[PDB]
Amino acid sequence: MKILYKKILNLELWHDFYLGQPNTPGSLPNNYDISRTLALVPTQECLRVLANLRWVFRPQLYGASLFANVNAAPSGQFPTIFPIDRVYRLTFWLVVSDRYFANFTNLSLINSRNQIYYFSNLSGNEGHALFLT
Amino acid sequence: MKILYKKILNLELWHDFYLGQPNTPGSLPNNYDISRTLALVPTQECLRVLANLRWVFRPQLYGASLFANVNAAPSGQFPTIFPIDRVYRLTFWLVVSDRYFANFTNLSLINSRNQIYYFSNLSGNEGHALFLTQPLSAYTTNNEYQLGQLVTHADKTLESLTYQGNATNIPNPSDWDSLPASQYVSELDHLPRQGTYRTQVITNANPDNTYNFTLVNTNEQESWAIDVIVPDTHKSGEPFSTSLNFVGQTPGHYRLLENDTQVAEFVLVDNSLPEAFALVEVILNPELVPSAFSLLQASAGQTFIQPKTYVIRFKNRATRWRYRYEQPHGCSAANLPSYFNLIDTHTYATARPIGLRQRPDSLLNDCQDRPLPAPSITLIQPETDGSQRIARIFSDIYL
Amino acid sequence: AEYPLPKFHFQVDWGGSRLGFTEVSGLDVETEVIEYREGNLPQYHKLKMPGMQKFSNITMKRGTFQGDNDFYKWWNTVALNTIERRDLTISLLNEKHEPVVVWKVNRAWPTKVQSTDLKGDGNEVAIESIEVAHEGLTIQNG
Amino acid sequence: AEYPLPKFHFQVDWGGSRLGFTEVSGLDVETEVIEYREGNLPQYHKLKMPGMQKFSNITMKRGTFQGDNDFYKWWNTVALNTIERRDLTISLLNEKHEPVVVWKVNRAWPTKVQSTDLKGDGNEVAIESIEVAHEGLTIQNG
Amino acid sequence: AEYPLPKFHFQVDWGGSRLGFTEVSGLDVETEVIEYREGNLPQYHKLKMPGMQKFSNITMKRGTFQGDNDFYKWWNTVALNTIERRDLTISLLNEKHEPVVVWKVNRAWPTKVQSTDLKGDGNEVAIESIEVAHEGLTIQNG
Amino acid sequence: AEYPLPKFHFQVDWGGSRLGFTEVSGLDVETEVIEYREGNLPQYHKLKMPGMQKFSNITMKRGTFQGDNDFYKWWNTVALNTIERRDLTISLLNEKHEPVVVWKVNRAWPTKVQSTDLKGDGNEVAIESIEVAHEGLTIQNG
Amino acid sequence: AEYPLPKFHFQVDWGGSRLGFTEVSGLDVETEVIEYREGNLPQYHKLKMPGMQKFSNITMKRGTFQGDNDFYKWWNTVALNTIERRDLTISLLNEKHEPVVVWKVNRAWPTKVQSTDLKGDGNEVAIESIEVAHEGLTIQNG
Amino acid sequence: SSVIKPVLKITNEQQNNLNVHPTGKSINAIRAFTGKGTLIWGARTLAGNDNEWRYVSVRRFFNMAEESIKKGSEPFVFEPNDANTWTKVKAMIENFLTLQWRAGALAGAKPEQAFYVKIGLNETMTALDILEGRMIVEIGMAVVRPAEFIILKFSHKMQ
């Protein structure tokens, strides 16, 4: 039983409290880390859908990653074990670990306890990166 | 009750990781020891057969030994308590104790998990010892040798340093090294191992016929047989698969035949000791083992013992040493040891492979004249080719 | 966040007037083991599964001051089988005095009060102790 | 291979987030003795034969860090008689960090968790402990 | 022959691969007392006579080496009520390595095996112990 | 040999799914005595001879599992004077998971079923019992 | 599965307000045996067949509260030979607060009520008991 | 349950050809027996001449076991390919197989005779496999097989 896995997604989270303003953004430094400030958590539906699709979730020092189960073709292209040709939807909670977070993060100081943030891949904004904002 | 015992067999195991290359092989040194790297283990059949023959097994610091129970004659000849005049077969597992063994032993790096090694006293090869390996092939012209092959030529033994799709009339000195004349282990001893159940395929399956399969061991005795009947709705000419069961046989070397034709040859295994490394077989048969290898003489209605010493030998691996740095080193192509090659400002490597030893005699000097540490045996880095062939093997030293 | 914590900077909310306790011990939780084996099991030792829970009493020690009679005050509110129960909070603080580890106790009433002993040759401060029973405990870290 | 080993370089796989334990004790195995004698035996002491097996609980101690609440997390997964069981691995390492001796535990769930005590005069780190029950143990050396 | 002997140079034959034990204790023999008195005896204390014999378990301690798993090997040969029994020999040697005092044990099988404990601050060697039961003991001196 | 067997590795064939019990007792056989004496016999005590046979009821105890209602199932197959009778086999097993001593019980039907008792403070498993009547018993050893 | 159930989490429907008891015992069923033998049977012991059924009384114990006089209330509804009969349900609960084993008791009325005893030196709670007769019982598992 | 009768009656002589055939394709029957109802009679696969995959229960059990092993050894993806991970993986597999043995699924007097697990450099792997990133594990298991035929022999007792 041969099982081949390949990375299929990169999710990164940046904060100028650590990075500052580089004169031209590239990649993060080699010592970047937010593993104690922010965390990504799959929901239950996300878990069972990843199970059905045979994909694997993994936390990282900069965010998370997804691994797909593929077949090794000669062309160099990697097909999935079966054609994923329907519509699918994956959701994740973003949780904060560091207290005083709302003090160094440039957020709105207006009283909002009935609102929540939201990020997606339906936002265009493809400049020097793929921005989920 | 007087009981007399005499040594009747010497089994030795050599490794160049400890010995090196002597200019002419004799005996081992007085401080030789592999008691923590390799071990010989008798099987169950071997145990009960040694019991019936009244022989005694004993481990040693270099291998093992066998002791026979004999009668003291005046002539100086030593006869066994009874005439051993039938055919007998003794088997032993060879097990490895030292991890990282596959790194300093010059073995084939190609993925083989369905094969096992095999050694016997039916291999001839009586040169300066009694070698239980197969005789090494000769250096020819226009053949294909992989990196690591050992051959024989002009009273010497040649090692391969790179891949050659077509050979030369005379050895190219930049592709071969020059060692003394001796035999070693090679890919000529890598037989496929098998368990209890087999899937055998008949080509051109003909419903109008039958087939009788047989199993033949080293003593040329039939040990097993069944029949298979192809049904009469099978379109003539297609392959046909069948299942075979060898549940009641003792592990060893066998040839599988179908109707007076060799179809396969393999070492049969019962997984009594699944992690065994190799198998050793020793035979008592006055017809199959030559006189240079036999251990019993027959005369005057009796048998007399002849002590012998059999040898197996392993050669060490050879890698290219690569020194890597954290901060830049200030040495240049104009001030470094001639045997080096500057790769970049943080790296330089040897130009020819060096052999892995435990107490490497002399170490290399730096351009500033300083001894450098030798590599470790925990990691090796083979690099594959465009055609997915092995091209080079390094050892990295981080300074 | 990267260093291990020390054990000498803490505080206790116990519905009492003053603060400044010396020793606080007794913070444990446990579950009982139940064992089982049937005759035909190939192993010759037993199987284990969880049972009921158990909690310990908590002990606190502090020094004696003029005008402060709070341990006795709380203990003395006892009628036949009725008493005044309180919620207890214990917190461990770090260098910047931020609560890091919190123990929450449920329904705690004082079962024992011990006063100091008097020695004509004792060069030490007078210390008093209280022992408390409760019906629950919960740990919160981070 | 020729030297005796020390006892201060080890690691524990316990399905927990962090590592770095201080003390690990409790690794034992035992069998009970059964005795027998009949009246006409010329010796006046008994014969002995093996019986049932017995295994001990395992104790582990570690230091306390901000944000780490894993012992409590594992202990608190207990329903009436159900709990989350894990496979435990303990390994002793040598100078070159190679696993030499391995202890494999089977079906282990936490039976007890003890937190630190608080002293106004204590110049020491805070340490916590866990006690674990299991249904098997196996030793592998070489 | 005229000097008293020391207690630090000895050896043990136990059918095991290696040698070099640190501690060996438990070498004892005993007999029970039976007491009796009838009403008209002029002395008002009892008479005593010998009864049954009793033997103790033997404990041995040694240091841990890479590749040596012999205590476990012997302990693990146990079926329901069958096990591999061995003859044990212990000898005390003098300056010229000549056996002087010999203890012969009869039918000994291992009842207990204890491994070392792990301490992050322990500057000592790792030691293991075995406990053995037997059905006889005999002393030979000179 | 010289060692006898233990009492904790057995199995029961009774017609139900599970094959593991915690207790099996009641395996006996008996014959009555008849006495006789005539007036002129020189001894003044009686002569004795065999009479009729008697067998006992058998009791079995096991632990309670979700989904298993077999004792009740067998008991509840009772009409006016008809019931489902079964052949019962009890065997005492050895190391090779085989049988050494076999008890064969003829024409068995359940006469009594007892369920567990419920205690708010009971830290034990729930156990149930069955009591069975039969018309014969036979022992086979070796 | 492989683990059985505990005995301390249950509930009782009996027609009164409170639903928590400390003890419930008496859940049994039985059938008598009838024996028969004729003179010419080659075996010298009897044949056995089923007879009539028998059920037991049920006992329940609980603690005493101010304002609750329910045992007496039910007992005191008795006229000459008429009384108020109720259907009784007993269930053994699981982690999800559901029922696994159910006992259904048919036509129950209280035959006995016992109050606590008074001790000037008794450090215990006051407990009361009721004993109930019925005309049927049924077990449901899974 | 909820069955009256099968539509056809099968005899033993027909069952002989349904159950065993030179082509290996086998047909399991459903037959009525006096007083017992209608019962399933036969438990073979379509590969009835295969010494390993003759029976349904063996194949289904193997499927279950390998699925559980896959799920157990998934979390180690993108972990260091060294001895420590190999130790952990072997421990997980052996604990699962021990639990399966003690319930009566596997044959053997101890867990040493019921199964074996091989993972390592000197067992199933080489340096090339370390560089590639591949892990190879070999697992052997002995399962219990049923009894299909019961033969009774009768005689007149000597007297």
Residue numbers in the entry:
A (entry chain AB): 1 to 133
B (entry chain FB): 1 to 399
C (entry chain BD), D (entry chain AD), E (entry chain FD), F (entry chain AE), G (entry chain BE): 2 to 143
H (entry chain AC): 324 to 482
Paper text:
Contractile injection systems (CISs) are a diverse, yet evolutionarily related, group of assemblies that mediate bacterial cell–cell interactions. Their contractile apparatus is homologous to contractile phage tails, using a contractile outer sheath to propel an effector-loaded tube into target cells. Here, we characterized a CIS in the multicellular cyanobacterium Anabaena, with features distinct from extracellular CISs and T6SSs. In contrast to cytoplasmic free-floating eCISs and cytoplasmic membrane-anchored T6SSs, Anabaena CISs are anchored to the TM, which is mediated by modified tail fibres and a baseplate component.
The resulting maps of the baseplate and of the distal end cap reached resolutions of ~2.9 and ~2.8 Å, respectively. The distal end of the CIS was capped by a tail terminator complex. In contrast to previously studied CISs, the cap of the Anabaena CIS was composed of two proteins, Cis16A and Cis16B, forming a C6-symmetrical complex that terminated the inner tube and sheath, respectively. The structure of the sheath–tube was highly conserved to related CISs and was composed of 23 hexameric layers of the sheath protein Cis2 and 22 hexameric rings of the inner tube protein Cis1. Further details regarding this spike plug and the bipartite cap in a related system are discussed in an accompanying study.
